[PDB]
Design a binder for this molecule. Structure first.
Ligand SMILES: CC1=C(/C=C/C(C)=C/C=C/C(C)=C/CO)C(C)(C)CCC1
Ligand code: NA
Length: 134
């Protein structure tokens, strides 16, 4: 199916402040986070994926099997714990992060040579787009 493997650089990041505000991230950290332009480093073998969000401040590592619920420790972000499931939805990845915040999750997919990531919480939608360096 779709292989997201790649070192992806951020081109677009819309509404990230609002998204972090909804996660109750403190103003200080939001200030910094919004100028980080994290890379996405993905290594995938079928339904097994490691997704590393990389920045000079902090990294965030996801390591999961598509379709299989797991205990997600969002330490360094909002330091919350979710019961998270990343599922196939055709060629898209659909992540649901069950926990304190309503409607928390994200959708990831490829359009041509672009990786699209939409992150959501409580009706806030942050839009990110990434590209590999050719
Ligand atoms: C706030 C904050 C950060 C937030 C990272 C986030 C919110 C990553 C979401 C990654 C996803 C949804 C990958 C799915 O392919 C990072 C840790 C960069 C630096 C410290 C500040
Ligand atoms: Na692992």
């Amino acid at each position: 199916p779709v292989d997201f493997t790649g070192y992806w650089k951020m081109l677009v990041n819309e509404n990230f402040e609002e998204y972090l505000r909804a996660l109750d991230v403190n103003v200080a950290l939001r200030k910094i986070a919004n100028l980080l332009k994290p890379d996405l480093e993905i290594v995938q073998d079928g339904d097994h994926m490691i997704i590393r969000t990389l920045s000079t401040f902090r990294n965030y590592i996801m390591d999961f099997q598509v379709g299989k619920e797991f205990e997600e420790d969002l330490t360094g972000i909002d330091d919350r714990k979710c019961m998270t499931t990343v599922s196939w939805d055709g060629d898209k990845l659909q992540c649901v992060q069950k926990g304190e915040k309503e409607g928390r999750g994200w959708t990831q997919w490829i359009e041509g040579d672009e990786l699209h990531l939409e992150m959501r919480v409580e009706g806030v939608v942050c839009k990110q787009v990434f590209k590999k360096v050719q």
